[PDB]
Design an enzyme around this catalytic site. Structure first.
Site, PDB file in Angstrom:
ATOM      1  N   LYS C  12     -23.029  15.937 -12.690  1.00 49.16           N
ATOM      2  CA  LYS C  12     -22.176  15.409 -13.867  1.00 49.16           C
ATOM      3  C   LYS C  12     -21.602  16.508 -14.571  1.00 49.16           C
ATOM      4  O   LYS C  12     -21.574  17.682 -14.217  1.00 49.16           O
ATOM      5  CB  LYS C  12     -23.145  14.663 -15.077  1.00 49.16           C
ATOM      6  CG  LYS C  12     -23.946  13.327 -14.339  1.00 49.16           C
ATOM      7  CD  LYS C  12     -24.606  12.593 -15.415  1.00 49.16           C
ATOM      8  CE  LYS C  12     -25.158  11.518 -14.852  1.00 49.16           C
ATOM      9  NZ  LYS C  12     -25.856  10.709 -15.944  1.00 49.16           N
ATOM     10  N   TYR C  52     -21.185   2.252 -12.789  1.00 54.96           N
ATOM     11  CA  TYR C  52     -22.155   1.696 -13.964  1.00 54.96           C
ATOM     12  C   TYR C  52     -22.014   0.285 -14.340  1.00 54.96           C
ATOM     13  O   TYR C  52     -21.944  -0.140 -15.622  1.00 54.96           O
ATOM     14  CB  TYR C  52     -22.156   2.611 -15.188  1.00 54.96           C
ATOM     15  CG  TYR C  52     -22.483   4.163 -14.900  1.00 54.96           C
ATOM     16  CD1 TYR C  52     -23.654   4.288 -14.592  1.00 54.96           C
ATOM     17  CD2 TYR C  52     -21.407   5.016 -15.247  1.00 54.96           C
ATOM     18  CE1 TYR C  52     -23.967   5.683 -14.579  1.00 54.96           C
ATOM     19  CE2 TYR C  52     -21.803   6.520 -15.167  1.00 54.96           C
ATOM     20  CZ  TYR C  52     -23.095   6.574 -14.687  1.00 54.96           C
ATOM     21  OH  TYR C  52     -23.332   7.917 -14.483  1.00 54.96           O
ATOM     22  N   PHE C  60     -24.180   2.179 -25.082  1.00 53.02           N
ATOM     23  CA  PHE C  60     -23.566   3.309 -25.041  1.00 53.02           C
ATOM     24  C   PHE C  60     -22.883   3.530 -23.651  1.00 53.02           C
ATOM     25  O   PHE C  60     -22.507   4.625 -23.157  1.00 53.02           O
ATOM     26  CB  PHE C  60     -24.994   4.326 -24.507  1.00 53.02           C
ATOM     27  CG  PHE C  60     -25.689   3.600 -23.445  1.00 53.02           C
ATOM     28  CD1 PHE C  60     -25.501   4.038 -21.991  1.00 53.02           C
ATOM     29  CD2 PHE C  60     -26.965   2.969 -23.725  1.00 53.02           C
ATOM     30  CE1 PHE C  60     -26.480   3.717 -21.132  1.00 53.02           C
ATOM     31  CE2 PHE C  60     -27.830   2.367 -22.684  1.00 53.02           C
ATOM     32  CZ  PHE C  60     -27.365   2.738 -21.235  1.00 53.02           C
ATOM     33  N   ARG C  88     -35.043  11.682  -6.195  1.00 55.27           N
ATOM     34  CA  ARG C  88     -35.060  11.129  -7.793  1.00 55.27           C
ATOM     35  C   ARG C  88     -36.449  12.326  -8.268  1.00 55.27           C
ATOM     36  O   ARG C  88     -36.438  12.621  -9.475  1.00 55.27           O
ATOM     37  CB  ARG C  88     -35.683   9.921  -7.866  1.00 55.27           C
ATOM     38  CG  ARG C  88     -34.516   8.780  -7.354  1.00 55.27           C
ATOM     39  CD  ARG C  88     -33.587   8.587  -8.506  1.00 55.27           C
ATOM     40  NE  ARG C  88     -34.228   7.812  -9.571  1.00 55.27           N
ATOM     41  CZ  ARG C  88     -33.533   7.203 -10.610  1.00 55.27           C
ATOM     42  NH1 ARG C  88     -32.039   7.176 -10.557  1.00 55.27           N
ATOM     43  NH2 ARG C  88     -34.330   6.579 -11.414  1.00 55.27           N
ATOM     44  N   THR C  94     -35.316  10.608 -15.736  1.00 58.72           N
ATOM     45  CA  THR C  94     -33.774  10.422 -16.158  1.00 58.72           C
ATOM     46  C   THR C  94     -33.814  10.781 -17.400  1.00 58.72           C
ATOM     47  O   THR C  94     -32.864  11.511 -18.058  1.00 58.72           O
ATOM     48  CB  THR C  94     -33.558   8.904 -16.059  1.00 58.72           C
ATOM     49  OG1 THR C  94     -33.558   8.556 -14.702  1.00 58.72           O
ATOM     50  CG2 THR C  94     -32.208   8.473 -16.641  1.00 58.72           C
ATOM     51  N   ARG C 105     -34.209  18.518 -14.251  1.00 59.11           N
ATOM     52  CA  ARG C 105     -34.018  18.290 -15.463  1.00 59.11           C
ATOM     53  C   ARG C 105     -35.092  18.861 -16.349  1.00 59.11           C
ATOM     54  O   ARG C 105     -34.829  19.135 -17.418  1.00 59.11           O
ATOM     55  CB  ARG C 105     -34.037  16.571 -15.707  1.00 59.11           C
ATOM     56  CG  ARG C 105     -32.816  15.844 -15.100  1.00 59.11           C
ATOM     57  CD  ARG C 105     -33.061  14.441 -14.666  1.00 59.11           C
ATOM     58  NE  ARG C 105     -31.787  13.993 -14.677  1.00 59.11           N
ATOM     59  CZ  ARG C 105     -31.703  12.687 -13.840  1.00 59.11           C
ATOM     60  NH1 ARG C 105     -32.666  12.192 -13.491  1.00 59.11           N
ATOM     61  NH2 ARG C 105     -30.429  12.277 -13.671  1.00 59.11           N
ATOM     62  N   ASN C 115     -27.913  14.691 -18.950  1.00 57.15           N
ATOM     63  CA  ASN C 115     -28.762  15.031 -18.072  1.00 57.15           C
ATOM     64  C   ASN C 115     -28.215  15.475 -16.686  1.00 57.15           C
ATOM     65  O   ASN C 115     -28.806  15.419 -15.592  1.00 57.15           O
ATOM     66  CB  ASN C 115     -29.687  13.553 -17.702  1.00 57.15           C
ATOM     67  CG  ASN C 115     -28.888  12.581 -17.251  1.00 57.15           C
ATOM     68  OD1 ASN C 115     -27.651  12.504 -17.271  1.00 57.15           O
ATOM     69  ND2 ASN C 115     -29.680  11.554 -16.411  1.00 57.15           N
ATOM     70  N   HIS C 118     -27.217  12.689 -11.456  1.00 58.51           N
ATOM     71  CA  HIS C 118     -27.432  11.574 -11.046  1.00 58.51           C
ATOM     72  C   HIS C 118     -28.088  11.324  -9.788  1.00 58.51           C
ATOM     73  O   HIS C 118     -27.625  11.926  -8.916  1.00 58.51           O
ATOM     74  CB  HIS C 118     -26.294  10.619 -11.288  1.00 58.51           C
ATOM     75  CG  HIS C 118     -26.308   9.313 -10.290  1.00 58.51           C
ATOM     76  ND1 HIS C 118     -26.935   8.095 -10.745  1.00 58.51           N
ATOM     77  CD2 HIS C 118     -25.977   9.064  -9.281  1.00 58.51           C
ATOM     78  CE1 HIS C 118     -27.029   7.127 -10.047  1.00 58.51           C
ATOM     79  NE2 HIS C 118     -26.306   7.404  -9.041  1.00 58.51           N
ATOM     80  N   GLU C 129     -23.420   3.081  -3.646  1.00 53.48           N
ATOM     81  CA  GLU C 129     -22.710   4.187  -4.280  1.00 53.48           C
ATOM     82  C   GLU C 129     -22.083   5.309  -3.416  1.00 53.48           C
ATOM     83  O   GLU C 129     -21.001   5.621  -3.529  1.00 53.48           O
ATOM     84  CB  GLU C 129     -23.961   5.060  -5.321  1.00 53.48           C
ATOM     85  CG  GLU C 129     -24.519   4.159  -6.165  1.00 53.48           C
ATOM     86  CD  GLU C 129     -25.433   4.956  -6.876  1.00 53.48           C
ATOM     87  OE1 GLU C 129     -25.930   4.231  -7.729  1.00 53.48           O
ATOM     88  OE2 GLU C 129     -25.937   6.087  -6.659  1.00 53.48           O
TER      89      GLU C 129
END
Ligand SMILES: Cc1cn([C@H]2C[C@H](O)[C@@H](COP(=O)(O)OP(=O)(O)O)O2)c(=O)[nH]c1=O
Ligand SMILES: Cc1cn([C@H]2C[C@H](O)[C@@H](COP(=O)(O)OP(=O)(O)O)O2)c(=O)[nH]c1=O
Ligand SMILES: Cc1cn([C@H]2C[C@H](O)[C@@H](COP(=O)(O)OP(=O)(O)O)O2)c(=O)[nH]c1=O
Ligand SMILES: Cc1cn([C@H]2C[C@H](O)[C@@H](COP(=O)(O)OP(=O)(O)O)O2)c(=O)[nH]c1=O
Ligand SMILES: Cc1cn([C@H]2C[C@H](O)[C@@H](COP(=O)(O)OP(=O)(O)O)O2)c(=O)[nH]c1=O
Ligand SMILES: Cc1cn([C@H]2C[C@H](O)[C@@H](COP(=O)(O)OP(=O)(O)O)O2)c(=O)[nH]c1=O
Lengths: 154, 153, 154, 154, 153, 154
Positions: C12, C52, C60, C88, C94, C105, C115, C118, C129
Site C-alpha cells: 500500500k 473494495y 470507512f 496471509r 489485518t 505487520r 497496514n 494487502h 484480484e
C-alpha cells in the site's frame, strides 16, 4: 545536480533466480532514492539487442543477450540527486572481481557475465534506457514523505 | 590506547528517518563500547559552540537551524583508534564521496543531511565530549568480551 | 495443494512511503515463493472501488479509497503451494494490533488503516484480484533454479 | 582461473566467542561460493605451529599460538572462481585498522591480534592449509543448484 | 490515543551482549517514536523502588543486584497502544515461553537474564517514566511519517 | 533444566543448497546457545536409516532417506538450558505449513519433505543422535565469555 535525476536499474535473470530482488531494492531504498517505475518483464530479443546495441561487435554480445533472455528481469527507474553515478557505485564495479564488499556485486556476484544487475553509465544513456524499457505513464509522480530529511535542497 | 573516546551524534535527519538502531549496531558490531548516550534537543548556543570553528563559512546559518530542527542522539564511544575508525565507519563527510558499507555510504546523499557527526581528532573529541556531556553521564563499565576484542592495552 | 497456486500481494502507499518494498519482497523471497508479476502502479479510482466492492457500504470506504490513491502501490503476484493461506500468515493479522512480531505487520505496522500491505484471503478472490490488477501477459512464466529443493512434489 | 579453486577460511577463537560464525558464513554464502568442508575443531599446538611455520621466529609467535589455542576454531574450505583473492578481500585487510567497512574485519574487528578470521593468501598456500586442517574424505563433493546462475563458464 | 507512552529499558545483559541497536530497531521499525533515552547506572534505591511490587518475592534481591551489575539503556517510546504492543514486541517475560520473532524469543533464555523491561500497564508506565526521567529529558517532536503510520489521532 | 543440556541440530541438504547455513547458525548464536560440535558431512545411507529408525515403515521413509542423501548435511550439537525444547521452537513446526513466521521454517520452508532442518525432539533422543552422528572427541569443551550474562544460574 538536482534531486530529480533518474537512472535505469535492472535486476538481471541471475539476480531474480538467486532471490536478490528484495536486497537489491533495499540498497537503493535505504540510500534515500525514490522508485518511480518498476515492472517484472521478459522482454523480446530485439529490445535487449537494442539496449546493448553499442556492444554488438564485442565477442561476448551473443552470450550476453541469451543470458538476458534466460529469465525474468526486474526493470526499475530510480530518482535522486546523482542517482546515476551513485547508483553505479551502489552496484559496484562492473566486473565483480574488482568490486568492493559492501556493494551489491561485492556481496553477491563473481562473474561479469553473471553480475546480477545493470545500471546506466551516464545521464544521457539513462534517459535513453528509460524510454526503451518504460512507457512515460509507467513513471509514477510522487514525493517522499522524508524528502526534506534526505535532501537539504531541491 | 583502547580507552580512547570519541563523540558520535545522530543528526535530526538520522533520527527522523529511523536510523538510530542501525547506526548503534554499526559501532556495537565493530567492538566499541558505548559509555554515554542521550536523546537531546540542545540550545542554539551549544550548537554554535559545537560548530564554532566554522562560524564564518557560508553554510553556518543553515547548519544551525537544521541541527535545531529535531532530536539528536548524542553518544560517546570508547575503543582503540575510535576517533579515526569511527569516522571511517561513518564514511566520507560528503555522502557522494562515501563508500557503500559505511553509514553515509548506505543511508545518505547530501552533505547537509549526512545523518551523523564524528569527532575528527582525539583533542576535538575531548572538547566535544565536555561540551555535550557532563562528567556524570559517562558510565564506567567493562565489556565481557574485552579480551576477545583487544589483545592488550 | 499444488505448487502453482497464485496470490495477489500489494504494498500500500504507506508501505512505499516508509521504505518497506525491499523487506516485504524479501519475506516472500526467503520463504520460497516465486514472483511471477510485479509493477509499480497508481491505479484509477474505479479499479480501487471495484477492488473494495464488498466494502462499498462500509463507513470507512471513502477514506480507504482516498488513502489507496495517496501514493504508489507495488502490486505483485506470488506463486507457491498454499501461497494464499501462507501469504496471509506472512503478512500477519489485518489489524496490526492483533498481529504477531515476525510477520510484516507485527514488524512495521500499527493502524489497520495504515497496514502497509494487502493479501488475497481466498484462492478464488486471488484469481479475481490478479485479473483485476494484471493483464495476462504481465504474468511471467519461469522455473526457479531451486524448485526441486523447495518442493518435494507437485 | 576456474570455478573449482579452493581456499582455507578459519574463524579464530575470538570470532567464535563473539558470535560471528553465522555472519561470516553468510558473507561467503551470499557471494556465491560453495562450502565443501567445515568442522569446529580445537587442533593440537603442533598443527597450529605448522600453520604459522613462517612466523616461528617473529616476536608475537608464542602469543599468537596461545591465542589460537584459547578456544574453538571453525575451519572451512570454500570453493569458487578466484575464491582465494576474493576471500581475502571479503575478510578485509589483515590489520582491521586498515580494513574497509563492509568487509568482515571492517565490520567486527579492531586489533590485528584479534582479527576474528584467517584466509589463505595464495592458491598454493591454500592447498597446503587444506591438507593441514582436513583429511581428504572431509571434502564434500556436490554441485550447487544455482551454479549456472553464479558462473558463466566452468 | 496515539500519544500513549511506555518505559522500555535494556537491562545490563542486553548492553553487555551488544543488543542496543537491534532492540531500538524493533521499536523504530514498528512505527513508534522515541521521545527519551539515556545510558544510566541508576542507584540501588531507584531500582528497589522500580520493582517495589516484588520486594516480597524471593528473587527480589538477585533481581536488584543483577540490575546494578551494568549499564542500562532507559527509553521512553510513544505510540498508539505502545504499552501493550511494546510488551508483545519484547515477548513473554520468561524467554522459554516467548515466541521467536520477539526480542526475548530471538535473544534470551533465562527470566533472570531477559535482556529488557517494559511497562505492563498504562498507569505503571507513567510511574516508571516519572521515576527514571526528569521532565526535561522528554523531547517533543513530530515524525515526518506520522500521517503514514497513523490514520487518525 | 541445567545449562549444559545438548541437542542435535542438522541443516538438511535443501538448507545447504539454498544458502541458509549462516542464517540458521545465527538463529542459535543470537539466542545464546553454544556450538560445541559441527561438521559438514555426507553420511552413509545406513546412518540415515539408523537416524530415522523410528519411522522405518512410514510411507515417506524411502523418499526421506533419499532426500537426506541428495546433498551435504551440516550436523551440529548446540548446548544450553532447555536447548532441546527451545531448539525445536526456533526451528518451527515440523510441517512448515503450520510454522509461525519468525521461526526458521516460518521464514524459509514450505514442504515438510523440504523443511530445511532437523532437531532432536527429546533429551534422550538427543543423546542417542549426538552419539550416532559425532565421535565424542568432536565435541569441544569451552565456556562462552558471556555465559553469566546469558544465564542467571548453572
Ligand atoms: C566484458 C563483459 C561485459 N559484459 C557486460 C558487462 C557490462 O554490463 C557490458 C560491458 O560493460 P564493460 O565495458 O565491460 O564495463 P563498464 O560498463 O564499466 O564500462 O557488457 C558481459 O556481459 N560479459 C563480458 O564478458
Ligand atoms: C560543506 C558543508 C559542510 N558541512 C558540515 C559537515 C561537516 O560536519 C562540517 C565540516 O565540513 P568539511 O570541512 O568540508 O568536512 P570535514 O569534516 O571532513 O573536515 O561542515 C555542512 O553542514 N554543510 C556543508 O555544505
Ligand atoms: C475496519 C477497517 C478495515 N479496513 C480495511 C483493511 C483491510 O484492507 C479491509 C479488510 O477488512 P477486514 O474484513 O476486517 O479484514 P480481512 O481482510 O481479514 O477480511 O478493510 C480499513 O481500511 N479500515 C478499517 O477501519
Ligand atoms: C603483525 C602481527 C600479525 N599477527 C598475525 C596476523 C596474521 O594472521 C599473521 C601473519 O600475517 P601478516 O604477515 O602479519 O599479514 P599478511 O597476511 O597481510 O601478510 O600473524 C598477529 O597475530 N600479531 C601481529 O602483531
Ligand atoms: C520470576 C522472576 C521474575 N523476575 C523478574 C521478571 C520480571 O521483570 C519481574 C517479575 O515479573 P513476572 O511477574 O514474573 O512476569 P510479568 O512481568 O509478566 O508480570 O521480576 C526475575 O528477575 N526473576 C524471576 O525469577
Ligand atoms: C510427515 C513427514 C515427515 N517427514 C519427516 C520430517 C521430519 O524430519 C520427520 C518427523 O516427522 P513427524 O513425526 O510427522 O513430525 P514430529 O517431529 O513433530 O514428530 O519425518 C517427512 O520427511 N515427510 C513427511 O511427510
Amino acid at each position: 545536480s538536482m534531486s530529480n535525476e533518474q537512472t535505469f536499474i535492472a535486476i538481471k535473470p541471475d539476480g531474480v533466480q538467486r532471490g536478490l530482488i528484495g536486497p537489491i531494492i533495499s540498497r537503493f531504498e535505504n540510500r534515500g532514492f525514490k522508485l518511480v517505475a518498476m515492472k517484472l518483464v521478459s522482454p523480446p530479443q530485439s529490445q535487449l539487442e537494442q539496449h546493448y546495441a553499442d556492444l554488438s561487435d564485442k565477442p561476448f554480445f551473443k552470450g550476453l543477450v541469451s543470458y538476458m533472455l534466460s529469465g525474468p528481469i526486474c526493470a526499475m527507474v530510480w530518482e535522486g540527486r546523482d542517482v546515476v553515478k551513485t547508483g553505479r557505485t551502489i552496484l559496484g564495479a562492473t566486473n565483480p572481481l574488482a568490486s568492493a564488499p559492501g556493494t551489491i556485486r561485492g556481496d553477491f556476484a563473481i562473474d561479469v557475465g553473471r553480475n546480477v544487475c545493470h545500471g546506466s553509465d551516464s545521464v544521457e544513456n539513462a534517459k535513453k534506457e528509460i524510454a526503451l524499457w518504460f512507457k512515460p505513464e509507467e513513471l509514477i509522480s510522487w514525493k517522499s514523505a522524508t524528502f526534506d530529511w534526505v535532501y537539504e535542497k531541491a
